[PDB]
């Protein structure tokens, strides 16, 4: 119990630390946002 | 057009010119191209 | 007397802040 619990503790702490440090680890939520934003921008630009 | 201090005007001119201090001037041509500009948070041109 | 022209001559095309 204790060893697996502690290994969880270390692994989870390190993974959040890395994710916070990793600046592109949120790729495809951002990508959905990018798709939506650029599509809306296009829908603007055809009005031009 | 150029001019000089204490310079005489005559119908004809020699190639010596007039004595003065040093200088320089550049000529370049402007042709249709395309640029990307970056504007910072304060709203001024920074990188072209 | 030849010099490469660096980033000179950039101008605001539309004067919109």
């Amino acid at each position: 119990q204790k060893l697996i619990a502690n290994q969880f503790n270390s692994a989870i702490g390190k993974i959040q630390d890395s994710l916070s440090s990793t600046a592109s680890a949120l790729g495809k939520l951002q990508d959905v946002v990018n798709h939506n934003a650029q599509a809306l921008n296009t829908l603007v630009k055809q009005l031009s | 057009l150029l001019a000089l201090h204490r310079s005489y005007l005559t119908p004809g001119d020699s190639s010596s010119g007039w004595t003065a201090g040093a200088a320089a001037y550049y000529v370049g041509y402007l042709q249709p191209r395309t640029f990307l500009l970056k504007y910072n948070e304060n709203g001024t041109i920074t990188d072209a | 007397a030849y010099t490469n022209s660096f980033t000179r001559g950039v101008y605001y095309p539309d004067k919109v802040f």
Partner: protein, 48 residues
Amino acid sequence: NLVKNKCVNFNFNGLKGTGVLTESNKKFLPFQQFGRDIADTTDAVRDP
């Protein structure tokens, strides 16, 4: 003519538009006529 917190049309050599007018953080260069936000939306006007 100049109103705030009540949205009106504005007509300056054309440029007719709807808008509510608010105090702004923009810093115009003196030769500029107006400014735009993201995706080319009229953000601010200086009265001629």
